Design a protein around this nucleic acid. Structure first.
Length: 81
RNA sequence: GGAGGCUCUGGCAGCUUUC
């Protein structure tokens, strides 16, 4: 879902970004922190913070991996930051 | 086959009571 996941407006709004994934369940906890630093969180940190669901950690890990890949590629519009 | 329930493994998932 790179069309909406890579969208800078969605990335700028962590809540909407989570709503796009459909895991808003963690949006109440993950929100409040930018995806730029959030992508730097490890699975153990995410587990310690919350989102115990391993599946959610796996999907979120893959999504964050793709986001990190896009961030490394730099194909994201500077509008994101 | 129909229906209800529970675990997250995050879905046309598994287990299970029942007709």
């Amino acid at each position: 879902n790179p069309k909406s996941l890579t969208d800078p407006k969605l990335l700028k709004n962590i809540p909407m970004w989570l709503k796009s994934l459909r895991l808003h369940k963690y949006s109440d906890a993950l929100s409040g922190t930018p995806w730029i630093e959030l992508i730097y969180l490890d699975d153990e940190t995410l587990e310690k913070k919350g989102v115990l669901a391993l599946g959610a950690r796996r999907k979120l890990l893959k999504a964050f991996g793709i986001v990190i890949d896009y961030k490394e590629r730099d194909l994201i519009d500077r509008s994101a930051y």
